Amino acid sequence: NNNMSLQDAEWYWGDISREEVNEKLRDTADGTFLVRDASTKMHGDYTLTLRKGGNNKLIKIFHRDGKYGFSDPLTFSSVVELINHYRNESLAQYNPKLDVKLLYPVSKYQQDQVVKEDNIEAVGKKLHEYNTQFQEKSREYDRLYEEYTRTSQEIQMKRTAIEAFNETIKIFEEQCQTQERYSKEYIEKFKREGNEKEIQRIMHNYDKLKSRISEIIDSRRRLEEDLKKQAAEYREIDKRMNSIKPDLIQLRKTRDQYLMWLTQKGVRQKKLNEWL
Amino acid sequence: SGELWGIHLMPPRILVECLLPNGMIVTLECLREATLITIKHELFKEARKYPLHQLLQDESSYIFVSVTQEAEREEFFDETRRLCDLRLFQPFLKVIEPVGNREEKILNREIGFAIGMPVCEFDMVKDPEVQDFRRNILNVCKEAVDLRDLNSPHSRAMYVYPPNVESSPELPKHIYNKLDKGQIIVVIWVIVSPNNDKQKYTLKINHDCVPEQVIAEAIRKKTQGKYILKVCGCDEYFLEKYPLSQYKYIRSCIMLGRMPNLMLMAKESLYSQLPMDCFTMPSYSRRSTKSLWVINSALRIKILCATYVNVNIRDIDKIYVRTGIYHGGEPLCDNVNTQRVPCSNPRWNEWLNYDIYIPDLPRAARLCLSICSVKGRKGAKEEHCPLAWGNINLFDYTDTLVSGKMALNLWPVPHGLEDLLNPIGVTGSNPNKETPCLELEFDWFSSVVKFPDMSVIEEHANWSVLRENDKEQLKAISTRDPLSEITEQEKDFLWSHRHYCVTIPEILPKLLLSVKWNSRDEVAQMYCLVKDWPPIKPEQAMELLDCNYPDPMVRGFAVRCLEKYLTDDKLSQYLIQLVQVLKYEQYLDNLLVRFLLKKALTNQRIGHFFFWHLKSEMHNKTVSQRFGLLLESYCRACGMYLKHLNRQVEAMEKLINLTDILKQEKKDETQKVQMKFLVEQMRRPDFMDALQGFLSPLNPAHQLGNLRLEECRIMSSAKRPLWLNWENPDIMSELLFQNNEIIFKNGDDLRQDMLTLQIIRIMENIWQNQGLDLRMLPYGCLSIGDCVGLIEVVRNSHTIMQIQCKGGNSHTLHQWLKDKNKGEIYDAAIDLFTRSCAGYCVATFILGIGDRHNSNIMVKDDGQLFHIDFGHFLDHERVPFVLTQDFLIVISKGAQECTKTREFERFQEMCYKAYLAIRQHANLFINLFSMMLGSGMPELQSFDDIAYIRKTLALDKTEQEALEYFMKQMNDAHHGG
């Protein structure tokens, strides 16, 4: 291509904001670029967005005396000539620290092949189907997120309860250790004085303490098993959301691409808004 | 989850199984509201029944120990507190010897209760940075305490009751004309008498009146520096010598035309009422490195493996780890990805190299990384989804580069985060061990690598190193908003003209965006410019504290500007954003936390909201530890106010529990049985004692008193918010308000409402300053926790839906305003309604809040119009507040015609002036919405959202074009207007 109008250029996008540019320049290779109208919205700016070092670098093109250029002097007839020149030659002429080639253009013609059945009612019905499928997918993802947050609170409360149970076991085992400490060398006094009623009641007290600590062991073990089961369910819900998420993102991309194609095809927005 | 594990309210008969030091076990039937000392009393009474009573010692030498519901062995030197408030996990109490200082442990219990998590795990956590912060923040705590005790008892009164003023000593022209020759009719209410008898005097004094001379002519009219002015109905005092009209109460009385009423109290009475803050010094305070720049190597990090990743095997084939070295939000080099290993065995053993050098690493460099999963076998497009994320500070708090192994526990993906990496997220490992963990390995350079100090940086400066004609480009870059379309041409122009940028102080945020932080010489030069930079305004200074400027010296310059310009009132206005940008700090110990704590410990009004803003996000585990440590520091050094805060917490948690037993147990039956259960639960004495006589969290000056049980109800909304009505213990406070109504709303997040009302208050302030009396009604809203908070209720106001229902139409609202206040004050009500409508229309269009219906917009009896239940602000273009004909009739004074209405033309003029004022001050609004990203609202995550308020304010278009933009928006609202 020797020279072509910028409206027919693949890299030129026209009237869009920085946000969709960042979405289309997101995690792409070095040198990926597009040309859009500047946000100041006056004729003749035609700013360029390039990706270098993982950053969305943004360059301004001036429109003095009917020409174009990155800086003074302006030695380009059209923006397409400048784009081709910096597409064949590195941009280091303007700035030596920007050692990057304009490798890949963000072509709006690339996403045209995604949509099929170009007639208006077919794309309307297809947009309706993907939009409602996105609706059940999103409501499933939010219900799963709600369940995940609730189960996470249950994990936190159950873990706090287990930690309290372990500290209770430490308390009661310290009590049993003190009982043994004050009883090991002192039951000989019981043997000399020879009363069996006090022996049987202190053994009853030790037995009921043993029953209490065994019951607390049983409760701690049961709640630990419940925590393991509920954490397994937590893992399953997390896995389910991680499975849903790429599908939801793909449905979002499909809906956005269909809406953009309908907007650029001259389709009425209000005629498609109320179908949902 | 209440007073026992699994039991909300314990039965009146409680079988405690206490634990004896001798070795015996008791089974004691304990009284319901019993205190611990009598529990020990008939513990030792029945101790004689069981053997080994001879080994037992006196009652007073022994202390109860038990495990609470927060998993810690609490020991109880506080015998005066009842068992209901003890929060037992199981009913047992071990009796042992003293093991520590009593006052320290009682203070620790109060601090842990106020925070909501124990100080014991702050002691037991082995992070050196946490312990070093806990030790070093006590220095500024002690300095703030000493400054608070510098001019005792006057400075203590300043701390407890700070002056509620605003910044400007002077008055706007549109309210100076509101007074008869600049005179304020003020009523001073002296209760000083042999009996408790009120009596009054009326004074016609000036607007620049010091309260000392106010009481001077008060005594002169009575028919001497020992009296103070206290505002009727609340704990607001006029202490420091300031103009009278500068106080917020007097200013609000000038705003609304209400009669200012004040006490005349003795200085000695307040000085004896205030106690001495016993700042006990905590116990834990007792407890060959080569430079960064001399390393000739590239930065590489080794990914070992992941212990487990929560991903399905038959839906996802491969997973990888995407990394990247970031400086805030912008990468210092290209992101590097690990090899796409199968998801069954996340085992990597892979070195990752980066396009950056070891000396080129900036001080605030962070390794942001995320395990991610691939997809796309069906179709030619392949997508990567975020799966788990984590950030590591490449330099720790000791200025040392990380090295060796590091087990980083990753965080769950934020809701609605498309981005593979999350550089805006917090740093550090996840405390939850049930999270995916990744083993990182940073390269070992045979020594400890330390970032160079200021000396080496300054020596590197001045080594790599007439006014120009076109200096207007610098001003043009300065005047644009922080999220402007800044080019590499403007960046190179800024960096090539950095020496001449010092003559425009407010261009520093742009210049810091021009410098590339992956270059050592540029970083050193920009540091040299920062060191000698002139101070900037606080509104511009807080911009340098968001996620876009993570550099410690940039944030230090911003904190110094906050020290040297920012006032207490603007700090209170901007306390939400300054608290939220504490998460953006990479280290617990920084200058911003010291500034916020020092200002919070010298101002109870500032410190109260500081405590509550930190407390409202303790549920967020991303910032739980840092805010918990800060809350520990504040609660140690605040003094007596902690007890008051404890009372507040009690009430709040009680209300939370009540709302719990209102919203997941009995949400199905009719409302009347719910009201019966409400009055039964709230009539019980301990709920009363928790809900009686505590300071209002919405306003610490408003001291809530007796609770009227007859009119505490539930509205018919979706989440069933709880209406509370409180009395005032003082008997003559009928002048300001006889009642305190508060909506306790749980389930709906109120951080959105807090941000919206703060922004609305700021628009009100800008409009009042410019010359427009465009009064808003930013009612008090304070979130207290996870989707739970408080809302101040506007007295004598009804929703438009209630007005329409009670009148029965289009003319019913104007008819109601005609009927409520007719006569010569009808014109004032009409002008008030029109003007408040214009201001709220402009604010709602600019903020773009959720769809407005008649249920969520209210009008007062005097005609003031205001908005409630914001919720969904910005985007979650669409004008929500379309001016309906119900308002067209009232603005046009009931005229059928609306297009050719002169009052409608004045409405247009006020709206246009408001839009131009907010467009002129939009830099502050963009700054405040950018500082709020780390909170995590569902509709505020990245700058893509702030582009909405960028577009509605028409900051991209010229100043003139915004006029026609507002024209077109209002004409589309009216279908021609």
UniProtKB/Swiss-Prot annotation, chain A:
<feature type="modified residue" description="Phosphotyrosine">
    <location>
        <position position="258"/>
    </location>
</feature>
<comment type="subunit">
    <text>Heterodimer of a regulatory subunit PIK3R1 and a p110 catalytic subunit (PIK3CA, PIK3CB or PIK3CD). Interacts (via SH2 domains) with CCDC88A/GIV (tyrosine-phosphorylated form); the interaction enables recruitment of PIK3R1 to the EGFR receptor, enhancing PI3K activity and cell migration. Interacts (via SH2 domain) with CSF1R (tyrosine phosphorylated). Interacts with PIK3R2; the interaction is dissociated in an insulin-dependent manner.</text>
</comment>
<comment type="subunit">
    <text>(Microbial infection) Interacts with HIV-1 Nef to activate the Nef associated p21-activated kinase (PAK). This interaction depends on the C-terminus of both proteins and leads to increased production of HIV.</text>
</comment>
<comment type="similarity">
    <text>Belongs to the PI3K p85 subunit family.</text>
</comment>
<feature type="modified residue" description="Phosphotyrosine">
    <location>
        <position position="145"/>
    </location>
</feature>
<protein>
    <recommendedName>
        <fullName>Phosphatidylinositol 3-kinase regulatory subunit alpha</fullName>
    </recommendedName>
</protein>
<comment type="function">
    <text>Binds to activated (phosphorylated) protein-Tyr kinases, through its SH2 domain, and acts as an adapter, mediating the association of the p110 catalytic unit to the plasma membrane. Necessary for the insulin-stimulated increase in glucose uptake and glycogen synthesis in insulin-sensitive tissues. Plays an important role in signaling in response to FGFR1, FGFR2, FGFR3, FGFR4, KITLG/SCF, KIT, PDGFRA and PDGFRB. Likewise, plays a role in ITGB2 signaling.</text>
</comment>
<feature type="domain" description="SH2 1">
    <location>
        <begin position="11"/>
        <end position="106"/>
    </location>
</feature>
Swiss-Prot record, chain B:
<dbReference type="InterPro" id="IPR000403">
    <property type="entry name" value="PI3/4_kinase_cat_dom"/>
</dbReference>
<dbReference type="Pfam" id="PF00792">
    <property type="entry name" value="PI3K_C2"/>
</dbReference>
<dbReference type="InterPro" id="IPR037704">
    <property type="entry name" value="PI3Kalpha_dom"/>
</dbReference>
<dbReference type="Pfam" id="PF00794">
    <property type="entry name" value="PI3K_rbd"/>
</dbReference>
<dbReference type="GO" id="GO:0005944">
    <property type="term" value="C:phosphatidylinositol 3-kinase complex, class IB"/>
</dbReference>
<comment type="similarity">
    <text>Belongs to the PI3/PI4-kinase family.</text>
</comment>
<dbReference type="GO" id="GO:0043524">
    <property type="term" value="P:negative regulation of neuron apoptotic process"/>
</dbReference>
<dbReference type="GO" id="GO:0046934">
    <property type="term" value="F:1-phosphatidylinositol-4,5-bisphosphate 3-kinase activity"/>
</dbReference>
<dbReference type="InterPro" id="IPR035892">
    <property type="entry name" value="C2_domain_sf"/>
</dbReference>
<dbReference type="GO" id="GO:0010629">
    <property type="term" value="P:negative regulation of gene expression"/>
</dbReference>
<dbReference type="GO" id="GO:0048661">
    <property type="term" value="P:positive regulation of smooth muscle cell proliferation"/>
</dbReference>
<dbReference type="GO" id="GO:0005886">
    <property type="term" value="C:plasma membrane"/>
</dbReference>
<dbReference type="InterPro" id="IPR029071">
    <property type="entry name" value="Ubiquitin-like_domsf"/>
</dbReference>
<dbReference type="GO" id="GO:0043201">
    <property type="term" value="P:response to L-leucine"/>
</dbReference>
<dbReference type="GO" id="GO:0005942">
    <property type="term" value="C:phosphatidylinositol 3-kinase complex"/>
</dbReference>
<dbReference type="GO" id="GO:0004674">
    <property type="term" value="F:protein serine/threonine kinase activity"/>
</dbReference>
<comment type="pathway">
    <text>Phospholipid metabolism; phosphatidylinositol phosphate biosynthesis.</text>
</comment>
<dbReference type="GO" id="GO:0046854">
    <property type="term" value="P:phosphatidylinositol phosphate biosynthetic process"/>
</dbReference>
<dbReference type="GO" id="GO:0014704">
    <property type="term" value="C:intercalated disc"/>
</dbReference>
<dbReference type="GO" id="GO:0097009">
    <property type="term" value="P:energy homeostasis"/>
</dbReference>
<dbReference type="GO" id="GO:0043457">
    <property type="term" value="P:regulation of cellular respiration"/>
</dbReference>
<feature type="domain" description="PIK helical">
    <location>
        <begin position="466"/>
        <end position="637"/>
    </location>
</feature>
